Design a protein around this motif. Structure first.
Motif, PDB file in Angstrom:
ATOM      1  N   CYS B 162       0.815  -1.211   0.000  1.00 41.91           N
ATOM      2  CA  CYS B 162       0.000   0.000   0.000  1.00 41.91           C
ATOM      3  C   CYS B 162       0.852   1.266   0.000  1.00 41.91           C
ATOM      4  O   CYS B 162       0.591   2.201  -0.767  1.00 41.91           O
ATOM      5  CB  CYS B 162      -0.938  -0.017   1.202  1.00 41.91           C
ATOM      6  N   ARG B 165       2.396   1.799  -3.321  1.00 41.67           N
ATOM      7  CA  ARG B 165       1.389   2.330  -4.234  1.00 41.67           C
ATOM      8  C   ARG B 165       1.142   3.810  -3.985  1.00 41.67           C
ATOM      9  O   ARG B 165       0.858   4.563  -4.924  1.00 41.67           O
ATOM     10  CB  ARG B 165       0.072   1.574  -4.049  1.00 41.67           C
ATOM     11  N   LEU B 166       1.245   4.238  -2.727  1.00 31.95           N
ATOM     12  CA  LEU B 166       1.040   5.641  -2.392  1.00 31.95           C
ATOM     13  C   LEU B 166       2.180   6.501  -2.918  1.00 31.95           C
ATOM     14  O   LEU B 166       1.957   7.483  -3.635  1.00 31.95           O
ATOM     15  CB  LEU B 166       0.919   5.806  -0.879  1.00 31.95           C
ATOM     16  N   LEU B 169       2.961   7.614  -6.730  1.00 31.95           N
ATOM     17  CA  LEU B 169       2.138   8.591  -7.439  1.00 31.95           C
ATOM     18  C   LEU B 169       2.837   9.929  -7.656  1.00 31.95           C
ATOM     19  O   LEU B 169       2.474  10.658  -8.587  1.00 31.95           O
ATOM     20  CB  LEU B 169       0.840   8.854  -6.669  1.00 31.95           C
ATOM     21  N   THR B 170       3.817  10.272  -6.828  1.00 31.13           N
ATOM     22  CA  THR B 170       4.384  11.611  -6.847  1.00 31.13           C
ATOM     23  C   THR B 170       5.900  11.557  -6.937  1.00 31.13           C
ATOM     24  O   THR B 170       6.514  10.565  -6.532  1.00 31.13           O
ATOM     25  CB  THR B 170       3.963  12.390  -5.591  1.00 31.13           C
TER      26      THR B 170
ATOM     27  N   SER C  70       6.864  12.088   2.576  1.00 28.48           N
ATOM     28  CA  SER C  70       5.848  13.017   2.086  1.00 28.48           C
ATOM     29  C   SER C  70       6.106  14.434   2.588  1.00 28.48           C
ATOM     30  O   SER C  70       5.995  15.407   1.826  1.00 28.48           O
ATOM     31  CB  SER C  70       4.462  12.536   2.505  1.00 28.48           C
ATOM     32  N   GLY C 147      -3.027  16.230  -4.022  1.00 25.57           N
ATOM     33  CA  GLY C 147      -3.015  14.801  -4.275  1.00 25.57           C
ATOM     34  C   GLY C 147      -2.311  14.025  -3.178  1.00 25.57           C
ATOM     35  O   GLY C 147      -2.725  12.919  -2.828  1.00 25.57           O
ATOM     36  N   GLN C 150      -4.972  13.934  -0.380  1.00 23.37           N
ATOM     37  CA  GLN C 150      -6.043  13.009  -0.733  1.00 23.37           C
ATOM     38  C   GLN C 150      -5.565  11.562  -0.681  1.00 23.37           C
ATOM     39  O   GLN C 150      -6.280  10.676  -0.199  1.00 23.37           O
ATOM     40  CB  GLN C 150      -6.574  13.353  -2.126  1.00 23.37           C
ATOM     41  N   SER C 151      -4.336  11.309  -1.129  1.00 16.86           N
ATOM     42  CA  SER C 151      -3.823   9.949  -1.188  1.00 16.86           C
ATOM     43  C   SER C 151      -3.427   9.426   0.184  1.00 16.86           C
ATOM     44  O   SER C 151      -3.534   8.223   0.432  1.00 16.86           O
ATOM     45  CB  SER C 151      -2.641   9.893  -2.152  1.00 16.86           C
ATOM     46  N   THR C 152      -2.984  10.296   1.094  1.00 16.78           N
ATOM     47  CA  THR C 152      -2.739   9.830   2.454  1.00 16.78           C
ATOM     48  C   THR C 152      -4.052   9.532   3.172  1.00 16.78           C
ATOM     49  O   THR C 152      -4.132   8.575   3.957  1.00 16.78           O
ATOM     50  CB  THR C 152      -1.907  10.860   3.217  1.00 16.78           C
ATOM     51  N   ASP C 154      -6.614   8.357   1.552  1.00 22.64           N
ATOM     52  CA  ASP C 154      -6.920   7.059   0.955  1.00 22.64           C
ATOM     53  C   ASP C 154      -6.141   5.940   1.642  1.00 22.64           C
ATOM     54  O   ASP C 154      -6.682   4.852   1.883  1.00 22.64           O
ATOM     55  CB  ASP C 154      -6.605   7.084  -0.543  1.00 22.64           C
TER      56      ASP C 154
END
Lengths: 201, 173, 173, 200, 115, 173, 173, 115
Positions: B162, B165-166, B169-170, C70, C147, C150-152, C154
Motif C-alpha cells: 500500500c 502504491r502511495l 504517485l508523486t 511526504s 493529491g 487526498q492519497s494519504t 486514501d
C-alpha cells in the motif's frame, strides 16, 4: 420577551446532540431526551416565529465564540481551522507590475484609498481583479485592485495611499462602489471576481 | 532659443518625475505582493504537513488498536487453556490429598496394632481405594495463534504494498 | 491363630502402604506435568505476542518513513516556490533602487539647472525612460500537494479496511 | 455504549451553565440548568461514575470531530490561534563562532547532522537554538548548539546542506540522541525555555 | 526453555501394576518394568523439559504396548530430581535391554530419539 | 625528497579542505540566521502596526458613538419643543375650526331674513365668542445645546493635548 | 316694527361676522407663526448637529495624524535595524565568498600533481587560514515599540474616560 | 435663513378691538389702528422671517402700550403675502404717524429698527 439566545443555544446543542445518537449507540434515555427536546424546540420555534436552521446558525457564532478555557479546550483542530489567515491573488505578478496610462484621468480620495480610472473607456465588459490579505471570513488589508477589459487592458486602479496605510474592509467596499459607479456611468458592464464578491458584498 | 527649450525640458522632466513617483509606489506594492505570496505558500505548506502528521498519527493509533485486539485474543486463549490446567491441578491435588491422608491414617493405625480391634479398625482401610476421576485432554489452539501471527505478517506485507502504491504517485526530490 | 492373622494383615497393610507411596509419587509427577504444560503454553503465548509487537513496530516504522518522505516532498516544493519568490523580490528591489536613485539624481540636478551645461547633462536623461523588467509567473504545484493529502487519506481508509479484514478472521470475547 | 451519553450530557451541561452564568440567558433556561444539574448528579450517583471525570471525558469526546465542524459554514465560526515567529537563543557572535572537537562524534539523524565532542565530561551543559516557529509548533531549525557553564561549544545540531528541511519530531529525536551521547559522559544537560516549549 | 509431552495427562496419571516387578536404581533414576511382558512391540513415550537442543530434566517416561498398556517406567528419585541427559540415556538402554531379553521389540518416540 | 613532501602537503591541504567545507557550511547557516532575524523583525513591525491600527479604529468608533449620542440628545430636545408646538398648533387649529364653522353658520342664517323667526333663529348665533384656552410660552433649552457644542470643542482641544503628550515621548524622523 | 328689528339684528350680526373673520385671520397668522417657530428650531438643531459632526471629523483627523506619525516611527526603527542586518548579511557573504574562492583554488591546485611547481603553488596555500570576521550585535529597540503600543492603548483608555466625562454633563431620561 | 420673534406666542394669539377703527392698504400690507388711544408710550413688536441681513416676509406686527394692550396691527393681505422690507418700513412710518398725530409716543424694538 426578547432574551431568546437560549433558544439558539438549545437549537445548536440539540443538533450536535443528534449526531451522537444519530451515529453511535449513545443511550436510550439519551435518545428519548433527543426526541423530547426535538418536539419542544419545534413548539418553541412555532411560538417564537423563528426558524430552526437560522437559529442553529446563530447558535454557531453565539457558542463557538466564547469557549475560553477553564480547562484545556477542543484543540480546535488545525485540519479544520488553520485558522484562515491567507493572502488571495486574482492578479498575476506581470499584471501587478505592469504600467498603464489613462487618457482621461479621474483621481478620487476614498478614505485611506486612492481610486484612479480612465474615463475614456466606454461600452466594455470590465472585470475587477485584486490581491489582498484575508483574515477569518473578512478582508483585512488590501494590496491592490485593478480593472481589466475583456482583452486584458488596465482601465482602473484602487490603491492604498503610500503615506497612509492601512484601512478596513468597508472602506474598500466604498471605493469599489465609487469605481463601479464612475465606470458604469460610461455605459460599461462591470463584473467582479469571486473572491472580491466574497469579501466586498 | 535655448532658454525656452530649457523651460520645455524642465517641464517635461517634471512630469516624468511624477510618473516615476507613481511607478516606484507600484514597485513597492509589487514587493508587498511577492512577500505576501511567499508567506501564503508557507502557510499552505505548514498546514498540509500538519494534516499529514495528524493522519499518520491516526494510522498509528489504528495500529495500536489492532495490536491490542490481537494480543487480547491471544491472552484469552492462553487463559482458557491455563484455567483448564488449573482445574486439573485442583483435581489432582485433591486426589493426592485423599491418598496422603489415608497413608497417614494407616501409619498411625499401625501404632495401636496389638489389640484385637486393630483388625476391625484396619480391615476397612485396606478396602477403601477410591482412586477414580477421569481427566479430559486440554489442547492449546496452535492453529489459531499461528494463523494470527501469519495474518499479521500478511497485513504488514500488504501495508508495505500500500505505501509503495502511495509513494509512486508523486515525484521525490 | 489370631497373632498369625495379625501379622498377616499387618503385612497386607504395609504392602498397600507401599502402593500408596507409589501412587502419591505418580500424583506429584502429574502435578509437575500440568505445571510444565501451563508454563509451556505461557511461553508460547509470550513468544507469539512479542512477534506480534515486532511486526506492528515494523509497520509503525514504515509509516514513519512514508510520513518523513511526504513531508520532505512538501517542504522542498515549498522551498522551491519560496526561492523563486525570493529571487523575484531581489530583481524587483534592484530595479526599484536603480529607478529611485535616478529619480533623486534628477531631483538634485534641478538646483544647478539654469546653468548652460544642464541641457547637455539632461538631454540624455529625457531619452532614458528605462522602465522594463519582465516577471514570469511562479505557481505552487497545488495539484501535487492536494493529491498527497487526498492519497494519504486514501491510505488511512484502506489501512482501516485491511485491519478489519484481519480482525474478522477470529472471534472476539 | 450506554455511558457515552452521560459524558456528552455533562459536557453540554457545563457549556450550558456558562451561558446563563455570564449572560442573561433566560429564566426557564436557568431552571432547566438547575434541574438537569440535579438529574446529572443523580445519574452520576446511580452510575457509579464520578461527575468531574466524566465531564472531562465528555470534553475530550465532544471535541475531536465531528465537533468543529461539518458540514455547513458559511460564516459564523473559525476556532484558532495563529502565530508566525523566529526564536533566537544564540547571539550572532555565538552563531558565527567556530569550534573544534577533540573526540569528534558525528551522526546522521534523519535530515539532521549531530556533532559532539566526546572529550567533555562532568559539566552542566545548556542547549541554545535558533529556529522558526509556526503556530505553537516548531517549523524549521536553523541551528542548535550546546554551551558549557563557561560558554564553550561542545555540541551542534545542524541541518544537512543538501537536504533541507525537516519536521519537529526529527529535531526531538536529534535532541534525544545528543543529550544521551553527552550524558553518557557524566554530563548534566539543561535546555532553554524556548526549546522546552517546542521539544518537551 | 520448553516442555515436551509425548504422553497425555490421562497416560501420565494412569495407574499400572507389574505382574513380575523389576526395579533398578540407575544413578539418580528409578527403572521399573513388568518381566511378564513378552513378544510385544513397545513404544517409549516421555514427558520432559528441554533447554537449547538438549534434555534438561525428565518428568516421566513410560513404555506402551501396541494396545496402549503400560509395562515399564522411568522416573526420577524423589530425593534426587536432578539428573542429566546421559543418565536418562543409560536408563533407557537398561530398560530396552531388560524388555528385549523377553523377546520384545522396542521403538522410541522421535522426541526421545532426538534427546 | 620532493615527491614525499608533495604527498605530505597534499594530505595536509586535504584536511584543510575538509575544515573549510565545515566553515563554509557554518557561514551559510549564519546567513540563514540573519535572513530569519530580518524576517522576524518584519513580522514584529507589521504586528505592532496592525495593533496600532486596531486601537485607532477603536478610538474612531468611540468618537462615532459620542457623536451619535450628542446628536440624539439634540434631536430629542428639538422633538420636545416641536411636539409642544404641535400641540399648540392643534389647539389653535381647533379654535380656528370652531370659529370657521360658526362663521359659515351665521352667514347662512342671515339669508333667512324677512321672517320674524329669524330673530329666534339668529339671536342664538350672536355672542358665541368661543375664545378659550391660554397658551404658555415654549422655550428651547439653548443653554444645553450651546453647552454641548462648547463641551465637544473642549473635548477636541483635550484630544489635541493628549496626542501631543503622546508624541513628545519619542523623536520623530 | 318687526321688519325693522329684523334689519337691526341683521346689521349687528353682520358686524359680528366681520369681527369673527378678523379673529380667524389672526388665528391663521398665529398658526403660521407656530409653523415658522418649529421650522426655526429645526434649522438651529440641524446646524448644531453639522457643527458637532465637523468637530468630530476634526478629532478623527487628529487621530489619523497620530496614527501615521506613530507608524512612521515604527517603520523607521524597523528600517534602521533592517539596514544594519543587511550590512551584516553583506559582510558575512563577502567572507563566505572569499573562502569559497580560496577553496576552489585549493581544489583545482591538487588535481594537477607530480610537478616541481606543484609544491611552489601549494606551499603558499598551506599558510592561508584566514578565518576571522567579528560581528557586532544588532538589537531592535523592543522597549520603544512596545511602549508605543502601550501608550496608544493608554490613549484609547484616556479617550474612553474622556467622552465618559462629556456625556455625564447632561441628564438621561 | 432664520425667523425672528419679538412677540410671544401668547401676545399674538389674543383678540383686541378698536374703539375708533382706522384701516389702510399700504401696498401689500394692511394697517389697522385704534384712533382712540392717546398720550401713551407705545412699543412695536413684530414676528417676521429674515434672510441674509434683510427682511423677507412679515408674519405679524402689533403695537403694545406700556400696560401691554394692543392698539395697532400690521398684517399682510391674504391674497398678497409677498412683499419687501421697504413696503413694511413705509407701513411702519404710516402707523407711527397715525398714532403720533394723536399725541402718542412710539418706540420700536431693536429688531424692527435693524430691518
Amino acid at each position: 420577551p426578547n432574551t431568546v439566545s437560549s433558544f439558539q443555544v438549545d437549537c445548536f446543542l440539540w443538533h450536535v446532540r443528534k449526531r451522537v445518537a444519530d451515529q453511535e449507540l449513545g443511550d436510550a434515555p439519551f435518545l428519548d431526551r433527543l426526541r423530547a427536546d426535538q418536539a419542544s424546540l419545534r413548539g418553541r420555534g412555532s411560538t417564537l416565529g423563528l426558524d430552526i436552521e437560522t437559529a442553529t446558525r446563530a447558535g454557531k457564532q453565539i457558542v463557538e465564540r466564547i469557549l475560553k478555557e477553564e480547562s484545556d479546550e477542543a484543540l480546535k483542530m488545525t485540519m479544520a481551522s488553520v485558522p484562515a489567515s491567507r493572502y488571495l491573488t486574482d492578479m498575476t505578478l506581470e499584471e501587478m507590475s505592469r504600467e498603464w496610462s489613462m487618457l482621461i484621468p479621474k483621481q478620487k480620495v476614498a478614505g485611506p484609498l486612492c481610486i484612479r480610472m480612465d474615463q475614456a473607456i466606454m461600452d466594455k465588459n470590465i472585470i475587477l481583479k485584486a490581491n489582498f490579505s484575508v483574515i477569518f471570513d473578512r478582508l483585512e488589508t488590501l494590496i491592490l485592485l485593478r480593472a481589466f477589459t475583456e482583452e486584458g487592458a488596465i482601465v482602473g486602479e484602487i490603491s492604498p495611499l503610500p503615506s497612509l496605510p492601512g484601512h478596513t474592509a468597508e472602506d474598500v467596499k466604498n471605493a469599489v462602489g465609487v469605481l463601479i459607479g464612475g465606470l458604469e456611468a460610461n455605459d460599461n458592464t462591470v463584473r467582479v471576481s469571486e473572491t472580491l464578491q466574497r469579501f466586498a458584498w | 532659443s535655448l532658454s525656452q527649450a530649457s523651460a520645455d525640458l524642465e517641464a517635461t522632466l517634471r512630469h516624468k518625475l511624477t510618473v516615476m513617483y507613481s511607478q516606484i509606489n507600484g514597485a513597492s506594492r509589487a514587493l508587498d505582493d511577492v512577500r505576501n505570496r511567499q508567506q501564503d505558500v508557507r502557510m499552505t505548506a505548514n498546514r498540509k504537513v500538519e494534516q499529514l502528521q495528524q493522519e499518520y498519527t491516526e494510522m498509528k493509533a489504528l495500529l495500536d488498536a489492532s495490536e491490542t485486539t490481537s494480543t487480547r485474543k491471544i491472552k484469552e486463549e492462553e487463559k482458557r487453556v491455563n484455567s483448564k490446567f488449573d482445574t486439573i491441578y485442583q483435581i489432582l491435588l485433591k486426589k493426592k490429598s485423599e491418598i496422603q491422608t489415608l497413608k497417614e491414617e494407616i501409619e498411625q493405625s499401625l501404632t495401636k496394632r496389638d489389640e484385637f480391634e486393630f483388625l476391625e479398625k484396619a480391615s476397612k482401610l485396606r478396602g477403601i481405594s477410591t482412586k477414580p476421576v477421569y481427566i479430559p485432554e486440554v489442547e492449546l489452539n496452535h492453529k489459531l495463534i499461528k494463523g494470527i501471527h501469519q495474518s499479521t505478517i500478511d497485513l504488514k506485507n500488504e501495508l508495505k504494498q500500500c505505501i509503495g502504491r502511495l509513494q509512486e504517485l508523486t515525484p521525490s526530490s
